[PDB]
């Protein structure tokens, strides 16, 4: 309902972009289009984030001369401010006095127009949208800026307060494997303890913190919990909380160092958990219905049938479309007309075929194994799965297809077959089957309608399907004597005999209820040779780097550069209308076949065919489009870059993804907008970034005082044409101070700005 900053009180929040006012960053971004990609987006982003934030912090520092002890917290979001020639070290009671002095005597947009430098506190955490600063200086908040924005900017409803302790009544803090309850998941507590309607049974998405009476907060939490009355204690996994890795009072405290501090407070019974609910998992319609996704691993304890069910593999159907075990609720199973064993479909708000393996009375999640839906990138912090009925009015894609496209685009690589869930059992069965097929008993079976004896799950099914109890005792009795010999068990020894029925039935035959063909049910799904190929064709990857953690602009600057994820997505859709998915699919199926068991000529020819479909320009651009969308989405957290390795042998690094997106769009070569160029092994052959930066600060200065007449030149063929008639122009002028120092050769300005 409102930001967890405000529902908890930790931080004060000031907005960075005012009411409906124009996006000055979207405008600067067409300096990137005019220069054909030779300015630096994240520098443009910096100038904007420094302006927007300096203005906000002043305007607050003025509306807050009346609430004057609340002002003092905003004072220390800015250390030193250079306006004109005078410099204002706000820590001085002197300088600060003077700063608020001129603050009133001149209107805001003129004070900001003149700030030449600004340095922010370690205390202010800047983002694309807000400036957060902590409420009281008394305590200390042991998490990094990235995580404060992560945890505290989300809207949650009114925050609860739960006791943490190890013995007694409260919440307990186990120390298990990381992600042990699934990735986005960080705890299992009872519906009652966080105040939900009696015996709720689902998952709920929270934004909690872990604090003490004195105002120190040691870990913050972001993700979901699993609500369930069937579990005994309310417990949070500690290794899934965000703690440490930050600098309190000049020292970095590591994860490990803060984890020590918690165990010491926890023992003293002075450690709470302030938790805010953000969305409670209903089951609501979409046809189709959907709710949140839980990992089956968070059920080995409570309801281990669910755990063990989704643990025993996924089966590829006869056409290669994986069928994945899910577990749905009563409500859902109703409205969508499904019962145990029904094949449905599911996708995250790739479209996979689902096999219902269970139905529960009070469940309102959709519980899946995550390793088998990694192809729909399900994330157990809030992601929702949709289920559609058995009606199947669509074409669900093959494992090779998308697994091959996903790989061509750097988001998966070497051809491995799977791990068969039933490997050793099926070898035994094939040894026995040799003899069975020769026997009289096999003639009897084929006379009663069972022709193909190769699928034991089918022979047993098709039997009990049609009468034939005697032929079933005979088939079941045959395979006993068979496996017992095959495994050297003595069939008389009553504990050796219970070991057969343990191996043949309990471990093998009974799974005929979940799977259709044992020969196609996998423990580790395979990697099709076409996708290992597809990945060797494009050398595109998403290289990780953290935003400078010392400097609070880097992140907010970074988040502004995300603000065209729109165009990255239209590029994908507009692109995919072209690709003939028919021929893509056949060319892949050709290769994977001719790979597995094919002659030498075809493993040659199917290779050259698929390759020519994969090197097709519209395919390459489609896959490259898909990568960029992931990178841009991830730059909302880290300084990710694109890297590409070309026929030159060299690899190019990009963090100007808006120029990359334009070049892809207008079918221009993408290499000149690269930031750094590396030499095969050799690195740093060309570092283009420092040039691109001071160029940016020049062109901005140009664009600005060309549009305002301070340059006697023709603001006409240029991007300054009509700028000064536009609302956004009043905004851009508030960042003239930060680009004043720059210089530009006035002749070549008209050329740059066209």
Tab-separated table of C-alpha atoms in Angstrom, residues 224-590:
chain	number	residue	atom	x	y	z
A	224	UNK	CA	8.675	-14.622	-0.362
A	225	UNK	CA	7.945	-16.785	2.617
A	226	UNK	CA	5.973	-20.013	2.588
A	227	UNK	CA	2.894	-19.819	4.772
A	228	UNK	CA	1.631	-23.113	6.243
A	229	UNK	CA	0.009	-24.236	9.518
A	230	UNK	CA	1.385	-27.796	9.087
A	231	UNK	CA	4.934	-26.614	10.015
A	232	UNK	CA	5.835	-26.179	13.648
A	233	UNK	CA	7.969	-23.111	13.854
A	234	UNK	CA	8.249	-19.800	12.233
A	235	UNK	CA	11.707	-19.738	10.752
A	236	UNK	CA	13.730	-17.600	8.424
A	237	UNK	CA	16.786	-18.830	6.680
A	238	UNK	CA	19.667	-16.522	7.446
A	239	UNK	CA	21.779	-17.275	4.348
A	240	UNK	CA	18.915	-15.890	2.197
A	241	UNK	CA	18.857	-12.484	3.882
A	242	UNK	CA	20.843	-9.495	2.645
A	243	UNK	CA	23.424	-8.585	5.269
A	244	UNK	CA	26.782	-6.875	5.439
A	245	UNK	CA	29.213	-6.143	2.602
A	246	UNK	CA	29.159	-2.463	3.385
A	247	UNK	CA	31.006	0.255	5.240
A	248	UNK	CA	29.831	1.410	8.673
A	249	UNK	CA	32.115	4.002	10.331
A	250	UNK	CA	34.958	3.482	7.875
A	251	UNK	CA	35.243	-0.289	8.227
A	252	UNK	CA	33.793	-2.777	5.782
A	253	UNK	CA	31.717	-5.357	7.619
A	254	UNK	CA	31.622	-8.631	5.694
A	255	UNK	CA	28.605	-10.929	5.530
A	256	UNK	CA	30.407	-13.135	8.045
A	257	UNK	CA	31.168	-10.232	10.378
A	258	UNK	CA	27.513	-9.183	10.592
A	259	UNK	CA	26.312	-12.775	10.950
A	260	UNK	CA	28.379	-12.861	14.151
A	261	UNK	CA	26.639	-9.752	15.488
A	262	UNK	CA	23.210	-11.281	14.934
A	263	UNK	CA	23.873	-14.563	16.764
A	264	UNK	CA	25.014	-12.461	19.701
A	265	UNK	CA	21.904	-10.222	19.774
A	266	UNK	CA	19.609	-13.182	19.087
A	267	UNK	CA	20.962	-14.988	22.171
A	268	UNK	CA	20.159	-11.931	24.313
A	269	UNK	CA	16.503	-11.994	23.255
A	270	UNK	CA	16.673	-8.473	21.825
A	271	UNK	CA	16.219	-8.935	18.089
A	272	UNK	CA	12.935	-8.375	16.244
A	273	UNK	CA	11.686	-8.792	12.697
A	274	UNK	CA	9.741	-5.948	11.106
A	275	UNK	CA	7.984	-7.502	8.119
A	276	UNK	CA	5.644	-5.938	5.583
A	277	UNK	CA	3.357	-7.957	3.332
A	278	UNK	CA	3.318	-6.932	-0.318
A	279	UNK	CA	1.050	-9.490	-2.034
A	280	UNK	CA	-0.724	-12.547	-0.621
A	281	UNK	CA	-1.025	-15.380	-3.116
A	282	UNK	CA	-4.611	-15.770	-4.261
A	283	UNK	CA	-5.690	-17.980	-7.165
A	284	UNK	CA	-7.163	-15.527	-9.669
A	285	UNK	CA	-8.196	-15.755	-13.321
A	286	UNK	CA	-6.393	-14.508	-16.447
A	287	UNK	CA	-8.784	-18.446	-20.305
A	288	UNK	CA	-6.389	-19.578	-17.523
A	289	UNK	CA	-5.726	-19.059	-13.827
A	290	UNK	CA	-2.543	-18.165	-11.976
A	291	UNK	CA	-0.890	-17.839	-8.578
A	292	UNK	CA	2.658	-17.579	-7.175
A	293	UNK	CA	5.350	-20.267	-7.615
A	294	UNK	CA	6.973	-22.255	-4.815
A	295	UNK	CA	9.940	-24.595	-5.045
A	296	UNK	CA	9.361	-28.236	-4.255
A	297	UNK	CA	12.541	-28.183	-2.186
A	298	UNK	CA	10.626	-26.147	0.401
A	299	UNK	CA	8.503	-29.196	1.094
A	300	UNK	CA	10.936	-32.025	1.928
A	301	UNK	CA	9.917	-31.251	5.530
A	302	UNK	CA	6.184	-30.516	5.441
A	303	UNK	CA	4.287	-32.538	2.823
A	304	UNK	CA	7.257	-34.584	1.506
A	305	UNK	CA	4.991	-36.248	-1.027
A	306	UNK	CA	5.086	-32.956	-2.954
A	307	UNK	CA	8.858	-32.938	-2.521
A	308	UNK	CA	9.454	-36.528	-3.578
A	309	UNK	CA	6.895	-36.321	-6.428
A	310	UNK	CA	8.630	-33.490	-8.399
A	311	UNK	CA	12.046	-34.933	-7.435
A	312	UNK	CA	11.811	-38.013	-9.655
A	313	UNK	CA	12.388	-36.509	-13.068
A	314	UNK	CA	10.662	-35.040	-16.126
A	315	UNK	CA	9.776	-36.943	-19.285
A	316	UNK	CA	10.238	-35.857	-22.878
A	317	UNK	CA	7.189	-36.781	-24.927
A	318	UNK	CA	7.352	-38.438	-28.369
A	319	UNK	CA	7.973	-35.118	-30.065
A	320	UNK	CA	10.448	-33.701	-27.558
A	321	UNK	CA	8.136	-31.387	-25.565
A	322	UNK	CA	8.985	-31.809	-21.844
A	323	UNK	CA	6.091	-32.544	-19.498
A	324	UNK	CA	6.838	-31.061	-16.092
A	325	UNK	CA	5.358	-32.108	-12.736
A	326	UNK	CA	3.429	-29.350	-10.978
A	327	UNK	CA	1.202	-29.414	-7.894
A	328	UNK	CA	-1.844	-27.160	-7.830
A	329	UNK	CA	-4.615	-26.299	-5.402
A	330	UNK	CA	-8.269	-27.303	-5.107
A	331	UNK	CA	-9.759	-23.987	-6.380
A	332	UNK	CA	-7.459	-23.850	-9.388
A	333	UNK	CA	-7.951	-27.536	-10.235
A	334	UNK	CA	-11.694	-26.845	-10.234
A	335	UNK	CA	-11.931	-23.695	-12.348
A	336	UNK	CA	-9.511	-25.160	-14.918
A	337	UNK	CA	-11.094	-28.640	-15.075
A	338	UNK	CA	-8.063	-30.672	-13.972
A	339	UNK	CA	-7.518	-33.861	-11.945
A	340	UNK	CA	-4.391	-35.818	-11.055
A	341	UNK	CA	-2.640	-37.032	-14.184
A	342	UNK	CA	-4.173	-34.332	-16.430
A	343	UNK	CA	-1.766	-32.697	-18.858
A	344	UNK	CA	-2.071	-28.891	-18.800
A	345	UNK	CA	0.108	-25.972	-19.876
A	346	UNK	CA	2.026	-23.440	-17.894
A	347	UNK	CA	4.100	-20.310	-18.486
A	348	UNK	CA	5.438	-17.457	-16.339
A	349	UNK	CA	3.406	-14.225	-16.740
A	350	UNK	CA	8.507	-20.213	-22.758
A	351	UNK	CA	5.237	-22.241	-22.642
A	352	UNK	CA	5.694	-25.738	-21.202
A	353	UNK	CA	3.430	-28.761	-20.959
A	354	UNK	CA	2.527	-29.630	-17.363
A	355	UNK	CA	1.582	-32.990	-15.820
A	356	UNK	CA	-0.484	-32.614	-12.662
A	357	UNK	CA	1.114	-34.898	-10.117
A	358	UNK	CA	-0.958	-33.858	-7.119
A	359	UNK	CA	-3.886	-31.744	-6.035
A	360	UNK	CA	-4.158	-30.276	-2.546
A	361	UNK	CA	-7.091	-29.106	-0.487
A	362	UNK	CA	-5.963	-25.634	0.631
A	363	UNK	CA	-3.040	-24.818	-1.713
A	364	UNK	CA	-2.915	-21.497	-3.516
A	365	UNK	CA	0.470	-21.673	-5.088
A	366	UNK	CA	1.631	-23.597	-8.135
A	367	UNK	CA	4.481	-25.761	-6.841
A	368	UNK	CA	7.080	-26.821	-9.419
A	369	UNK	CA	10.560	-28.239	-9.475
A	370	UNK	CA	12.723	-25.322	-10.534
A	371	UNK	CA	15.456	-27.194	-12.412
A	372	UNK	CA	12.886	-28.387	-14.959
A	373	UNK	CA	11.319	-24.981	-15.525
A	374	UNK	CA	14.650	-23.114	-15.688
A	375	UNK	CA	13.552	-22.755	-19.355
A	376	UNK	CA	10.824	-20.374	-18.207
A	377	UNK	CA	13.203	-18.663	-15.723
A	378	UNK	CA	10.843	-18.915	-12.778
A	379	UNK	CA	11.948	-16.849	-9.805
A	380	UNK	CA	10.435	-17.625	-6.417
A	381	UNK	CA	10.332	-13.968	-5.353
A	382	UNK	CA	6.839	-13.151	-6.521
A	383	UNK	CA	6.824	-14.678	-10.036
A	384	UNK	CA	3.452	-16.164	-11.012
A	385	UNK	CA	2.705	-19.298	-13.017
A	386	UNK	CA	-0.361	-19.491	-15.276
A	387	UNK	CA	-2.093	-22.806	-15.914
A	388	UNK	CA	-4.412	-23.418	-18.852
A	389	UNK	CA	-6.878	-26.315	-19.187
A	390	UNK	CA	-6.327	-29.611	-20.972
A	391	UNK	CA	-7.997	-28.076	-24.052
A	392	UNK	CA	-4.555	-27.531	-25.665
A	393	UNK	CA	-5.630	-25.102	-28.441
A	394	UNK	CA	-1.978	-24.241	-29.242
A	395	UNK	CA	1.496	-25.449	-30.304
A	396	UNK	CA	3.833	-25.844	-27.272
A	397	UNK	CA	7.427	-25.749	-28.305
A	398	UNK	CA	10.020	-28.501	-28.454
A	399	UNK	CA	12.989	-28.866	-26.122
A	400	UNK	CA	15.509	-28.471	-28.943
A	401	UNK	CA	13.768	-25.342	-30.384
A	402	UNK	CA	13.941	-22.747	-27.582
A	403	UNK	CA	16.845	-24.434	-25.764
A	404	UNK	CA	18.621	-23.741	-29.095
A	405	UNK	CA	17.476	-20.142	-29.516
A	406	UNK	CA	18.121	-19.381	-25.817
A	407	UNK	CA	21.652	-20.628	-26.351
A	408	UNK	CA	22.324	-18.713	-29.603
A	409	UNK	CA	21.541	-15.641	-27.454
A	410	UNK	CA	23.868	-16.229	-24.484
A	411	UNK	CA	21.155	-17.138	-21.935
A	412	UNK	CA	21.579	-20.913	-21.490
A	413	UNK	CA	27.345	-25.237	-23.484
A	414	UNK	CA	28.227	-28.627	-24.703
A	415	UNK	CA	26.212	-31.566	-26.047
A	416	UNK	CA	25.357	-33.875	-23.162
A	417	UNK	CA	22.607	-36.521	-23.091
A	418	UNK	CA	20.536	-36.457	-19.985
A	419	UNK	CA	20.662	-38.613	-16.904
A	420	UNK	CA	17.990	-41.262	-17.255
A	421	UNK	CA	15.954	-41.570	-14.068
A	422	UNK	CA	15.441	-45.266	-14.800
A	423	UNK	CA	18.792	-46.177	-16.377
A	424	UNK	CA	19.751	-49.215	-14.340
A	425	UNK	CA	16.204	-50.581	-14.075
A	426	UNK	CA	15.680	-50.363	-17.846
A	427	UNK	CA	18.911	-52.241	-18.630
A	428	UNK	CA	17.780	-55.106	-16.408
A	429	UNK	CA	14.370	-55.044	-18.082
A	430	UNK	CA	15.926	-55.196	-21.569
A	431	UNK	CA	17.958	-58.245	-20.528
A	432	UNK	CA	14.797	-59.940	-19.234
A	433	UNK	CA	12.834	-58.710	-22.267
A	434	UNK	CA	15.185	-60.585	-24.578
A	435	UNK	CA	13.965	-63.861	-23.127
A	436	UNK	CA	10.370	-62.776	-22.540
A	437	UNK	CA	9.896	-61.943	-26.222
A	438	UNK	CA	10.917	-65.463	-27.237
A	439	UNK	CA	8.651	-67.145	-24.639
A	440	UNK	CA	5.167	-68.534	-24.865
A	441	UNK	CA	4.094	-65.892	-22.341
A	442	UNK	CA	4.790	-63.176	-24.898
A	443	UNK	CA	2.434	-64.782	-27.402
A	444	UNK	CA	-0.340	-64.878	-24.795
A	445	UNK	CA	0.147	-61.161	-24.110
A	446	UNK	CA	0.102	-60.166	-27.776
A	447	UNK	CA	-3.046	-62.285	-28.213
A	448	UNK	CA	-4.779	-60.257	-25.489
A	449	UNK	CA	-3.942	-56.997	-27.219
A	450	UNK	CA	-0.519	-55.979	-25.860
A	451	UNK	CA	1.674	-55.939	-28.926
A	452	UNK	CA	4.681	-53.798	-28.027
A	453	UNK	CA	6.362	-55.345	-24.977
A	454	UNK	CA	9.065	-52.676	-24.886
A	455	UNK	CA	7.321	-50.243	-22.513
A	456	UNK	CA	6.766	-52.064	-19.213
A	457	UNK	CA	4.723	-49.140	-17.937
A	458	UNK	CA	2.480	-49.643	-20.954
A	459	UNK	CA	2.270	-53.416	-20.755
A	460	UNK	CA	1.169	-53.130	-17.117
A	461	UNK	CA	-1.223	-50.267	-17.816
A	462	UNK	CA	-2.833	-51.755	-20.906
A	463	UNK	CA	-3.341	-54.941	-18.908
A	464	UNK	CA	-5.207	-53.728	-15.922
A	465	UNK	CA	-6.987	-51.566	-18.384
A	466	UNK	CA	-8.534	-54.595	-19.908
A	467	UNK	CA	-9.340	-57.492	-17.618
A	468	UNK	CA	-6.412	-59.848	-17.923
A	469	UNK	CA	-5.676	-60.277	-14.251
A	470	UNK	CA	-4.059	-63.648	-14.958
A	471	UNK	CA	-1.750	-62.361	-17.675
A	472	UNK	CA	-0.808	-59.551	-15.278
A	473	UNK	CA	0.108	-61.913	-12.437
A	474	UNK	CA	2.092	-63.747	-15.089
A	475	UNK	CA	3.877	-60.697	-16.444
A	476	UNK	CA	4.488	-59.421	-12.885
A	477	UNK	CA	5.599	-62.899	-11.828
A	478	UNK	CA	7.835	-63.210	-14.880
A	479	UNK	CA	9.671	-59.990	-14.204
A	480	UNK	CA	10.178	-60.953	-10.555
A	481	UNK	CA	12.052	-64.172	-11.357
A	482	UNK	CA	13.853	-62.192	-14.037
A	483	UNK	CA	15.231	-59.261	-12.059
A	484	UNK	CA	15.969	-61.537	-9.114
A	485	UNK	CA	18.314	-63.553	-11.339
A	486	UNK	CA	19.597	-60.419	-13.056
A	487	UNK	CA	20.537	-58.933	-9.670
A	488	UNK	CA	21.587	-62.175	-7.986
A	489	UNK	CA	18.956	-61.950	-5.263
A	490	UNK	CA	17.746	-65.210	-3.698
A	491	UNK	CA	13.982	-65.222	-4.217
A	492	UNK	CA	13.333	-67.454	-1.197
A	493	UNK	CA	14.976	-65.302	1.521
A	494	UNK	CA	11.993	-63.241	2.709
A	495	UNK	CA	14.105	-60.137	3.235
A	496	UNK	CA	15.808	-60.654	-0.124
A	497	UNK	CA	12.317	-61.024	-1.632
A	498	UNK	CA	11.059	-57.836	0.018
A	499	UNK	CA	14.142	-56.239	-1.579
A	500	UNK	CA	12.932	-57.211	-5.090
A	501	UNK	CA	9.433	-55.788	-4.527
A	502	UNK	CA	11.401	-52.817	-3.192
A	503	UNK	CA	13.394	-52.478	-6.431
A	504	UNK	CA	11.059	-53.662	-9.180
A	505	UNK	CA	7.777	-52.191	-7.934
A	506	UNK	CA	8.338	-49.424	-5.378
A	507	UNK	CA	11.299	-48.008	-7.318
A	508	UNK	CA	10.206	-48.700	-10.890
A	509	UNK	CA	6.822	-50.065	-11.971
A	510	UNK	CA	4.677	-47.905	-9.665
A	511	UNK	CA	5.850	-44.738	-11.453
A	512	UNK	CA	3.644	-45.857	-14.344
A	513	UNK	CA	1.115	-43.477	-12.740
A	514	UNK	CA	3.248	-40.388	-13.354
A	515	UNK	CA	5.163	-41.240	-16.553
A	516	UNK	CA	4.123	-42.674	-19.911
A	517	UNK	CA	7.443	-43.982	-21.207
A	518	UNK	CA	10.232	-44.839	-18.722
A	519	UNK	CA	12.764	-44.597	-21.572
A	520	UNK	CA	12.039	-40.851	-21.875
A	521	UNK	CA	11.875	-39.734	-18.200
A	522	UNK	CA	15.009	-37.815	-17.182
A	523	UNK	CA	16.715	-36.775	-13.936
A	524	UNK	CA	19.099	-34.255	-15.622
A	525	UNK	CA	17.402	-33.149	-18.850
A	526	UNK	CA	19.881	-33.146	-21.789
A	527	UNK	CA	21.441	-30.371	-23.872
A	528	UNK	CA	20.715	-30.841	-27.574
A	529	UNK	CA	23.751	-30.747	-29.847
A	530	UNK	CA	22.054	-28.038	-31.939
A	531	UNK	CA	22.107	-25.696	-28.935
A	532	UNK	CA	25.813	-26.260	-28.212
A	533	UNK	CA	26.280	-25.485	-31.924
A	534	UNK	CA	23.969	-22.469	-31.745
A	535	UNK	CA	26.058	-21.095	-28.873
A	536	UNK	CA	29.340	-21.450	-30.761
A	537	UNK	CA	27.903	-19.361	-33.603
A	538	UNK	CA	27.166	-16.171	-31.714
A	539	UNK	CA	29.754	-15.182	-29.114
A	540	UNK	CA	27.457	-12.915	-27.135
A	541	UNK	CA	27.507	-12.899	-23.307
A	542	UNK	CA	26.311	-10.684	-20.458
A	543	UNK	CA	29.346	-9.664	-18.397
A	544	UNK	CA	28.719	-8.751	-14.703
A	545	UNK	CA	30.266	-5.797	-12.773
A	546	UNK	CA	28.954	-3.995	-9.693
A	547	UNK	CA	28.103	-0.314	-9.666
A	548	UNK	CA	30.707	1.658	-7.645
A	549	UNK	CA	29.431	1.138	-4.088
A	550	UNK	CA	31.151	4.214	-2.646
A	551	UNK	CA	29.441	6.682	-5.026
A	552	UNK	CA	25.639	6.959	-4.702
A	553	UNK	CA	25.074	8.270	-8.234
A	554	UNK	CA	26.361	5.139	-10.077
A	555	UNK	CA	23.265	3.119	-9.245
A	556	UNK	CA	20.707	5.844	-9.929
A	557	UNK	CA	22.622	6.825	-13.057
A	558	UNK	CA	22.586	3.131	-13.984
A	559	UNK	CA	18.856	2.822	-13.442
A	560	UNK	CA	18.182	5.758	-15.778
A	561	UNK	CA	19.957	3.916	-18.569
A	562	UNK	CA	17.322	1.162	-18.205
A	563	UNK	CA	14.654	3.609	-19.309
A	564	UNK	CA	14.434	2.306	-22.860
A	565	UNK	CA	13.801	-1.383	-22.152
A	566	UNK	CA	10.705	-0.586	-24.205
A	567	UNK	CA	12.582	-0.322	-27.472
A	568	UNK	CA	14.650	-3.435	-26.698
A	569	UNK	CA	11.354	-5.355	-26.546
A	570	UNK	CA	9.738	-3.946	-29.697
A	571	UNK	CA	12.954	-4.921	-31.510
A	572	UNK	CA	12.396	-8.490	-30.416
A	573	UNK	CA	8.704	-8.706	-31.412
A	574	UNK	CA	9.182	-6.897	-34.732
A	575	UNK	CA	12.128	-9.211	-35.389
A	576	UNK	CA	10.426	-12.547	-34.607
A	577	UNK	CA	7.580	-12.000	-37.058
A	578	UNK	CA	10.214	-12.620	-39.759
A	579	UNK	CA	11.897	-15.834	-38.601
A	580	UNK	CA	10.391	-18.907	-40.249
A	581	UNK	CA	9.930	-21.109	-37.173
A	582	UNK	CA	8.968	-24.059	-39.394
A	583	UNK	CA	12.409	-24.270	-41.085
A	584	UNK	CA	14.225	-23.386	-37.836
A	585	UNK	CA	12.544	-26.344	-36.218
A	586	UNK	CA	13.224	-28.826	-39.019
A	587	UNK	CA	16.853	-27.705	-39.430
A	588	UNK	CA	17.402	-28.295	-35.708
A	589	UNK	CA	15.653	-31.690	-35.741
A	590	UNK	CA	17.721	-32.673	-38.755
